[PDB]
Amino acid sequence: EKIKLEHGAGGEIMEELLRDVILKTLTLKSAGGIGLDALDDGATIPFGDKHIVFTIDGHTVKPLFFPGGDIGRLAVSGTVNDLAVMGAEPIALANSMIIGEGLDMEVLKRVLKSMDETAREVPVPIVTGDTKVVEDKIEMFVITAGIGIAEHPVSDAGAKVGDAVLVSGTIGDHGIALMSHREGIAFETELKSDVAPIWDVVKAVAETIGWENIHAMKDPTRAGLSNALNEIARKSNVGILVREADIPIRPEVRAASEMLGISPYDVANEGKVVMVVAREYAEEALEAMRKTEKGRNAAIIGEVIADYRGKVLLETGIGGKRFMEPPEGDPVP
Template structure:
């Protein structure tokens, strides 16, 4: 059921409650008023304002953007809710937009499902929803349907969000983890590990003077520019949980190729390097929320880098490695000291609840 359809009038009430309580999930007037005030008031658009149990789209209109639909979903449980450079709402919108963009799709529509813990301040919820509204506006997507649930105090941790997204893939785009070929180049769009370090610092786990902002940002415009420069991008993925190392291992295993990284070419903030040294973390595995990894034909490297560097999200883009024939399924890091080491797939979780 689309709980965002609960308000069937034009006038949207302003709730007086200061904290979420169980009546806000009861299906009655309290829930309807919460949804109408906090969610519909923020996300209102032609699809949502129909106030049905689902959003309905014209297939002919969708078809003007491309030939295939892309569909994704993700759930966000980040702790803390607010951190330097973003918050759970900003993260939920951009994370889903980016998952669609990694197929080359143009993101169009999102859903929003929330699980609220009894006792959550209404003002906190308003801040998160407003952040989602701003992020959706900036990304050019609409939040068109949703759901709200309230659980007893202690049954969740303040607020969880699920977002699903629909986009359309233009004709002629064929991006897949299985398409990496020897001679291809590995490109990233900027510094690694910023989001993971931001969450660590926001939790008070590091006594660092400098503030590291999360890199949370939408990447679909950057991807569109890259595709204009090279329509034949072979592999593309955002380096979230598990970081660069995990993405490259997935590419190497799916394509049955080897990938060699050059350590000296990896862009890292000094603050992030310091945080990793203090905690014994490897920045190759640290999470990002605004970084992508692309595998492109070798002859297209300069054109793709130029297109990326022309946009804010890609100004620090760099070529950091190459695809080789062997060893198949392996990622090798060539160190600054002239040695090399195997970069395995991440086992376990370096840092829980980072998104």
């Protein structure tokens, strides 16, 4: 038995590894709240009238620099977003770097510069860190952990029947752009990544309809939108109907995905948030989102249903019906 590239692609195969090994071998997985078993964007720890949200994320994106961002902006964006979809405000970041022997000092400096610029946007400080250097020709790996405070934590199992499903922006910008960058595909207007912290987007909605009406969230990163939705459906044991015509997708993204032969629904997003809200607050959330710089393109894509529990039903543009299958992992165009 060998570990395959897919065992870490965030899809079904990785879920197998987590279910057949990781969660199966670890026995102590909770500190009084949401734990490892929940496989949520982060864990929670009851601490008074509050809850501490804890999360960690490894970043190994290649190349370290790409249209719209870098492994540095990504490291900060990812951890802040994972805290945010839990309903927590970023408090501090811990930064671990594993650098390959021979990296250009200018690369490390540039990455650090981006991390800092990104951190100040939240804002959130990087209070502790670690630095390792290996001979392995790896360039760089950035692992960021983060702690946040949530008055009312949100999980992937809060979705209720009748609830509406929203996304803060266009789907597939990060994943596709990075792919189009690989195959050398050029552009009229360069297709860039969307990597960016979106705490302000979540905060805005909560500050508009209240945390009590935000029943679920998740940043659709690895495996993309479909994966994030399939996760919410399973853990909430609800069904999810999505209307393909309401999913925001850039023309460049559609075009490139087609040529690449990969659905933009299965690719990672680094600047978006999926939000399941109370049916009578969807419009306010949508508008509260539209009023933010990172949420201009938000849109209600569907609703939580009672049928097809644990699955994601997709109503195609022409009116057809099919399931939005969670990808097996990393796309291959």
